[PDB]
Amino acid sequence: GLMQFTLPVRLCKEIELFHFDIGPFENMWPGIFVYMVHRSCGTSCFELEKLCRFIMSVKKNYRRVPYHNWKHAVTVAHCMYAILQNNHTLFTDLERKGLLIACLCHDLDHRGFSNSYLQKFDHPLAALYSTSTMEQHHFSQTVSILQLEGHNIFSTLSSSEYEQVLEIIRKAIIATDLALYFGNRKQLEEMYQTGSLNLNNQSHRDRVIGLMMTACDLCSVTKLWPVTKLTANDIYAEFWAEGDEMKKLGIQPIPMMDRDKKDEVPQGQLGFYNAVAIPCYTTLTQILPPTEPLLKACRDNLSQWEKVIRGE
Numbered sequence: 001g002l003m004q005f006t007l008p009v010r011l012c013k014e015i016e017l018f019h020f021d022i023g024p025f026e027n028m029w030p031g032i033f034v035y036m037v038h039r040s041c042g043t044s045c046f047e048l049e050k051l052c053r054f055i056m057s058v059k060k061n062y063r064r065v066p067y068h069n070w071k072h073a074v075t076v077a078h079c080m081y082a083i084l085q086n087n088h089t090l091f092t093d094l095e096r097k098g099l100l101i102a103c104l105c106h107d108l109d110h111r112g113f114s115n116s117y118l119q120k121f122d123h124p125l126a127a128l129y130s131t132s133t134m135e136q137h138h139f140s141q142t143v144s145i146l147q148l149e150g151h152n153i154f155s156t157l158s159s160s161e162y163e164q165v166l167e168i169i170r171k172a173i174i175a176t177d178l179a180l181y182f183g184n185r186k187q188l189e190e191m192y193q194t195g196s197l198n199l200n201n202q203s204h205r206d207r208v209i210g211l212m213m214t215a216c217d218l219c220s221v222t223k224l225w226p227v228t229k230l231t232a233n234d235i236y237a238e239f240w241a242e243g244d245e246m247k248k249l250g251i252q253p254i255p256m257m258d259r260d261k262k263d264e265v266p267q268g269q270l271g272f273y274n275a276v277a278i279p280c281y282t283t284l285t286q287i288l289p290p291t292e293p294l295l296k297a298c299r300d301n302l303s304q305w306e307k308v309i310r311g312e
């Protein structure tokens, strides 16, 4: 059924653009992902049946949380697709498969709870994974689906390449732990300003992929303002529900997760743009000039938040 899906020709044009918003096309998301894999990686590299099977299983293991859900997975994969299409030749074919798959799978089985929560309230997952808690779990879920019957889309890879693609996927998913981003962007920016960055240097290459994963993960801020606004609602719906569980336990949450502090949201976004998103896309545009429209769109939404703060 996914196997016989064909993308409407109007989308074939729009999907290539960074600002493309998948939201209005829920029924088409699995088929959008196939399309993107076929365009980037070619039509002959995965068995169609397996890919579709794998996709429908990835969907099934995303939970119905307000933000970290199937819609989010596809949004992040789409941003990567546009990054890759615009920078096709800088990356190996193996990196394109892994990085599209990693993005689809990067928040697999998210409960609507942060790493801090699981750590603070000594959740089992935080016992198995001490840092990048959920992110290690997300990868562990990725491998588990790959290992299901008729799901191993990489089964025609040699052993060497299978373990290469898993490693690209592992690093990529871990990179989506925002705690790791700040150090990553700092190094990458220094490597850039000192003329020392080298894409054939593998550790550098891992870092650039890291920044890409971040840039994809945050990409709500690069959509048109009305889509940006509406996604923020999803983000805070999930944060506030976590802060609610903390209050039930007589723990005052951080303001970000306290629905009683929503007046502080516009300034909370403002800060996030200044400390996180603007710098991300700034360094990303430096390394990969064709990704500039992400920074442009990010800047436009920053100034919308600046407008909001002052009664506009």
Ligand SMILES: Cn1cc(-c2ccccc2)nc1CSc1nc2ccccn2n1
Pocket: 217, 218, 219, 220, 221, 235, 255, 256, 257, 261, 262, 264, 265, 266, 267, 268, 269, 271, 272
């Ligand atoms: C950091 N922060 C802090 C606040 C805030 C909100 C209300 C009260 C006090 C602080 N909001 C934020 C924005 S959190 C965030 N995370 C993502 C991921 C993708 C796209 C947008 N955001 N915003």
Ligand SMILES: [Mg+2]
Pocket: 106, 107, 176, 177
């Ligand atoms: Mg995540």
Ligand SMILES: [Zn+2]
Pocket: 072, 076, 106, 107, 176, 217
């Ligand atoms: Zn994510």
